[PDB]
Structure formats: structure tokens, C-alpha cells
Symmetry: C3
Subunit: 261 residues, 3 copies
């Protein structure tokens, strides 16, 4: 019996695109094809006016075991006609990081190796208490790809990054949180309810605010002055500020209107 | 009627954000008062330490929403606009003296920006913190956004700003938004002892390190290090500290600014 | 009765160099001679092919009480023939931080003043739950040396660094961890077992991976493009990647082979 093929699927409802990493026979490991699919899918979701928020999640009760080891060179060192190589896992990471819309990773079960790199490409990660996280290049003889390694260092600092990468240890979700690898941890019995509420919240906020701030955060410590001037000047011209002020003063929830162009 | 008040005793300037009807929201006038007050405190030889807190049991609800444009987008005769909340922030962050924010109750919107302009924040366990520009359709001002990103990292900053969620003080601490959390029953006593501690440390050490920390990651910095390192043994505090330690007693330090 | 002289010793077994700060009469405070010994030793350890990992630990049940206060000027302000002064504690710190091999500080008991500086020059710190950490220059009227101050600022952020330095408070290990001063905390009853397992882990990982990543982490936000290109290109030429892939696919532990040249 041959395994069911690994794939990245998407389901869209109420402005939320649920992107699922589905390769359960390999604990949701990423194949080269899966990386290519993410790479193609993220710009389509960014252009789709029916999508306001992206949610990234593993099929079943596990997030992602990393690049598939049985095809590791094709994922990280894939030869190209011009004589370079391509790291498809990093290109997938970048496609997710370039989304202008909010993206959240919901991590349950195991998030291993390049799984964290994909998860961390989202804006932030919410983990189930029972999840485990390990970055294991050192268990395999490879190097964590540059964008992942730099992002780690910036999120958790130099010392924690070394603890994480040199030992390749597996951490519980509350440990991962203490280290800075994830933004929040939710008990298992309420994980589903809390993630659904979180998503509803992101669907209620001003999209002008979220788009602007996501972009301005991403530029911080990466010119940047021109982007700030443009966003600050767009702010009163967007309809969301007036709607937000007046909702607040009337003690009601705002019905925001700005949409990406 | 909203106002900034100050009381000075034993080298401690207690600055209070007082606008209780609006849960200590900042008006434009209040921002202008902070802006004027900080440099006076810095020049006052009777002030060693500044403590910032809210009137009653609540810290600051942010820029007053009913006058939001006046606080953040105040038009100026040359055609620019002013952000008075950021100017206030910057007046607090330019203090050369140690400044601590004591946060109880709610610290919302720009409240965190004012609090975080101090050197660090100590929160009561029952306090709540939310940064809510995304609930209003605005953008967090640049100094505050950047400071946030540098204190909590990119991912936590987005979690905080994109959701605009309200966090308990322990959660805020886990995220990096405040430096420590004290249970409610012992908050006042512990804050008072913290303040007594700052008042008994070497002021040469505090002044120097606050400044060197603030310069870290902003030739210019080399000269400041060389000047401070060279001033260190010429200040009296080092000899007083060494000898107090060896005699097993608490040092009575003497260096004073300016 | 004269005190037993403070010293830095090393013991080497199974590729681990255990470096011990031994000056128990002063709670393992560092004298000038001890700082000079660290400074001379670290490069020897880096060049010794029998050493793969360095572990830094205090004699007995305490780590380090900082520069010895009774000889503070000779450690921090040591006069030199050209009229300048030398900070031996910082030079010891730099010698440790220049190690290309993995280095871990195991902190028990007290780690005070410049003790944190020496510990934080290692890649990361594992603390016993009963350990205490305080950075106390402000209790003494001095300034934390620049490499330490900057490292602190980068590891814990500006606000936590000012809380730590301006108060000079002593923190418990779990507090120090919450602030970012140490990477992990282990209960006292299992500290020895868990440190030994940690060290065995580091001795099991790919040394190609550890060397490369340590160096790339240390370069992040410090030329860097060329280093990345060289390491990435070396990766498939090193034998460790092929050994790591096969071991994983055969469900066994890898026996890695790369060694530094
Ligand atoms: C860094 As690449 C060649 O995988 O785009
Ligand atoms: C015009 As401004 C940057 O001083 O608020
Ligand atoms: C900064 As020095 C001359 O003590 O190495």
C-alpha cells in the first residue's frame, strides 16, 4: 500500500482562509510539492477579496514535522537551470511572510524542524498546551535556513537561539512560550473555542490598522520614513478612523469598512 | 479638569495622571503639561527619582477619544501636525534620572506608550493592559510601535497590535510589556520598597547606565563610554561602595548630577 | 592561616572540557589571575582536538560572586605601562565568547555582578532552580562593563536591562528566566541528571551544524553574506548531512563525523 499524497489545501468561509498542511502519513512533513503549493497559494490569497485573514494549521492533531527527510535535498538544495539551488522551504516561508493580510499559525501536536520556520512566517503562533516544538537541524547535520535562523535570533535573542539550535531539544508549549517561540498557549480543553474567538476578533478589527501595522512592524529595523509618512497620512483618509471614533463614543462595536486595493 | 500633578518628597517626584472621569485618559493639555514638567524635574536638584502613576486605582486609558485628533493630529501653522502624546513620551524618555511607571487598573491604548517611556514598568497583578489602535481604526504612533517591537519582538508585537486584546498583568509580563508583577495585597508596600532601593543605589551608576543603555544600538557611543568609564574611579561612589561592602554595611553614596 | 588560591581548572573527558571556577573562600569570586587564566585557556581549548564541548561551572554549589571586591581595581582598571588600563574580566569574557566550540554555563547558587557576564559569554545558561542572579554595579558605584552591558541589553531588552541594572536586585532563577537572563531552569533534585543529559546531547549532535550555527547566530546583527554562502555550500560537502538523513530513515541515532580543521 502506497501512502496518500501530501498536500496543502485551503478552505474559505466568512473572510477566513484556512490553510491546512496535510500529510498525515509523515506527520504533516513538507514535501517539495507542498512547498511549491504554499508558494503559489499565498499570493492568490493576498489578491482574493473574499479573504481577510489567513489561518495556518495542520491536518488532524499535529502541525508539521518539517521538511520531509526522505526528500530533504530536493526541498533545501533543489538544482536550478542557472546553476544555483533553491531552498523551497524558505521560499514558502517568504511567500507566507509577504502576505499583507493577517496570518496566524495554530499549532497542535508536533511542530518540528522547518515546521517552526513555516509557523513563524505567520504574524504569530498560538499553541495548544499539549503541543511540542523542536528545531532539529543539528540532529540531522544541516543548518537552519537563513531567514528562519535570523527570525529566531530576533524573536528569542542570541542565547535562547543557541540553546534551541545547538541542543535540538524538544520543548513543551509552555517552555516554548517562555523562550519566545510562540505568542500564546491555550489549554487543550479550550483550544478550539479560543482560537475561533481569536479569529473572530481579527475579523472585527480595522483592516486599515492591521495592514498598516503589520507592514510597519515588519519594516522596523529592516525609506522606512516614507512608509511611515504615507501610512500616517492615509490614516485620517481611510474611513475606519471616523467609524472607530464614533462607535467608541456611542459604546458600540464598530462596523469597519476599509479594504485592501 | 484633567491634569498632571506632582508631589516631591525625599528625592522622589511622584507624578500623577489625574483625569478620573475619563479613567485617566490623556487630553492634549495633559500631554503639554508632561512635556513641560519633565525637563523641570530633570533640572530640579531636589529630585533624584521619578515615579509615574495614575490617580485612584487606574493608570491611563490612552489618548482621550473625544479629542483624539487634537492629541495625535493637532494641526500646526506651518501645515504639519503634531502628535502631543509622542512629544510627551519623548519628554519622559529624555529624563536623565531614573523613572518607573507603577501601573494599576487599566493601561489602554497610548497609556502603554507613556508608561514604557519610563525606564521600566511594575504592574499590580490585577492590572490590565491592551494596545487598541486596531479597535479604533488608527495606527500606534511610531515611537511607541518601535519601542514595542524592540521590547517584545516582532511576533508578540503583532499579536498585541493586530488583536488589540486586553491582557492581564501576568500575561503582559510573559509578553515582555512590563518588567514585573506584584500581587495586589503587597503592591503598595513592594513599590515603596522598590523606590527606597532606587534612592539608595549609586546615582553615578544609575545616571551612567541609564544613558549607556539608551544609547545602545542608536564613535558617538565610544566617546560616551570612554568619558563614563574614566569618570567612574574619579566619582566618590566607587570608593564608598567598595569600602561599604568590605565592612559589611550599606553604602551611603554621594555623587550628584550637575 | 592563608586562603587557598583561587584558580580556573579544566578537566577533559569524552570530548567535554569542564572548566571550573574555583575560589570557594570568596564564593568563587574572580581574581585578576583567574581572569588571566580564562583568557589563556580558551584558545587552547579551541585548538585542542580532544575537546568538542566546553562546560563552565563553579566549584561546589555556587557559580561566581563576580570580580573580587577586595581586588576590584586590579580586575577592572588594571594599570598598564602605556598609562591605559585593562579590564581583565572583559578580556576573559571575550576569550570565552570567541570559542568556536559550543559552551554552556551551569549556574548553581549565586551568580553575582560580573558572574553573569562570564556566564553569558557562553552560548547559554542553564540554572538550578535554587540559584540566584543579580547584576550589582549600582550597589558598588561602578558601571557594568560594556560587553556585558550590551549583551544584556540585547538579551533582555532595554526596559528589563534597566530594571535589572538600576535596582541591582537579586532574582531567583525562575525570575531570571522570565527576564531572559538564563535559558532554562531545572529543579534542584534533577539538576545533575539533566545537565549531564544536556551535555550528552550536545556531544551527539552534528558538530558541523553546531559550529556553523553558533558562528552564524553570533554574526546576526554584528561580510555576513559571504559566511552564509560558504557555510551553505559546505553543508552538503560535510559528511554529517548524509549520515543524519540515513540515520533518521533507518530509525537510529546518527554517528556524526565532521570535525573542525
Ligand atoms: C535563497 As533561494 C536560491 O532558495 O531563493
Ligand atoms: C510633528 As512631531 C514628529 O514633533 O509630533
Ligand atoms: C577594553 As581593554 C584595553 O580592558 O581590553
Amino acid at each position: 500500500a502506497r501512502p496518500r499524497t501530501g498536500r496543502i489545501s485551503v478552505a474559505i468561509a466568512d473572510g477566513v482562509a484556512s490553510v491546512e498542511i496535510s500529510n498525515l502519513a509523515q506527520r504533516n512533513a513538507l514535501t517539495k510539492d507542498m512547498c511549491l503549493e504554499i508558494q503559489e497559494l499565498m499570493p492568490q490569497l493576498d489578491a482574493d477579496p473574499d479573504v481577510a485573514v489567513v489561518v495556518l494549521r495542520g491536518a488532524g492533531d499535529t502541525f508539521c514535522a518539517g521538511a520531509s527527510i526522505s526528500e530533504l535535498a530536493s526541498v533545501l538544495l533543489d538544482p536550478q537551470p542557472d546553476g544555483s539551488t533553491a531552498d523551497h522551504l524558505s521560499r514558502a516561508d517568504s511567500a507566507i511572510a509577504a502576505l499583507s493580510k493577517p496570518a496566524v499559525a495554530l499549532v497542535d501536536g508536533a511542530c518540528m524542524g522547518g515546521g517552526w520556520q513555516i509557523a513563524s512566517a505567520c504574524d504569530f503562533i498560538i499553541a495548544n498546551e499539549r503541543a511540542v516544538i523542536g528545531l532539529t537541524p543539528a540532529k540531522i547535520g544541516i543548518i537552519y535556513p537563513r531567514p528562519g535562523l535570523e527570525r529566531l535570533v530576533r524573536l528569542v535573542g542570541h542565547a535562547n537561539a543557541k540553546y534551541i539550535l545547538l541542543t535540538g531539544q524538544t520543548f513543551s508549549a509552555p517552555e516554548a512560550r517562555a523562550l519566545g517561540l510562540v505568542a500564546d498557549v491555550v489549554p487543550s480543553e479550550s483550544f478550539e473555542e479560543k482560537c475561533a474567538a481569536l479569529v473572530r476578533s481579527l475579523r472585527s478589527r480595522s483592516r486599515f490598522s492591521m495592514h498598516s501595522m503589520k507592514r510597519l512592524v515588519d519594516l522596523t529595523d529592516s525609506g522606512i520614513d516614507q512608509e511611515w509618512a504615507a501610512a500616517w497620512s492615509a490614516m485620517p483618509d481611510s474611513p475606519d478612523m471616523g467609524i472607530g471614533i464614533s462607535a467608541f463614543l456611542n459604546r458600540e462595536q464598530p462596523r469597519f469598512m476599509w479594504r485592501p486595493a
